[PDB]
Amino acid sequence: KYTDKYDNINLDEILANKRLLVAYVNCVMERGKCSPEGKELKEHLQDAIENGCKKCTENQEKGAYRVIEHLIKNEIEIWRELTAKYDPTGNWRKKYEDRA
Numbered sequence: 461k462y463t464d465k466y467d468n469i470n471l472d473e474i475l476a477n478k479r480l481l482v483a484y485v486n487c488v489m490e491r492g493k494c495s496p497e498g499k500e501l502k503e504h505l506q507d508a509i510e511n512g513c514k515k516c517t518e519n520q521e522k523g524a525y526r527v528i529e530h531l532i533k534n535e536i537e538i539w540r541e542l543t544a545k546y547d548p549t550g551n552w553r554k555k556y557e558d559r560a
């Protein structure tokens with residue numbers, strides 16, 4: 461499994477604060493520096509997409525759905541950029557949008 465050492469991160473505060481959210485977005489989109497957490501996400505995001513979170517902790521799976529639903533509803537443009545870069549064949553795009 462991926463490490464659980466950052467699993468207590470406060471996702472609600474990241475989603476509530478645009479400056480914070482965009483810092484992570486810029487890290488993963490390679491246009492900004494990465495915090496230790498952001499870096500750990502950037503290094504495992506493609507793998508997780510390729511195997512449907514096979515190595516994710518329960519908290520990470522829960523967290524992913526939370527963040528993805530927020531991006532789809534409130535930052536559609538950021539969702540489009542992320543899904544296109546990290547999921548180019550669209551393995552999960554329609555699935556998450558349908559759930560959202």
Ligand SMILES: OCCCCCCCCCCCCBr
Nearest residue numbers: 466467469484485488497501
């Ligand atoms: O232990 C799980 C690590 C995840 C920490 C980073 C969460 C950042 C959520 C914001 C992402 C926005 C799109 Br990049």
Ligand SMILES: OCCCCCCCCCCCCBr
Nearest residue numbers: 500501504508509512513524
């Ligand atoms: O279908 C799965 C795609 C959702 C993206 C999973 C995010 C990966 C979380 C891994 C945790 C990295 C440690 Br910070």
Ligand SMILES: OCCCCCCCCCCCCBr
Nearest residue numbers: 520523524527543547552553
């Ligand atoms: O089509 C799939 C694209 C998935 C992009 C996911 C980015 C957000 C993942 C945040 C993970 C938080 C773990 Br706590």
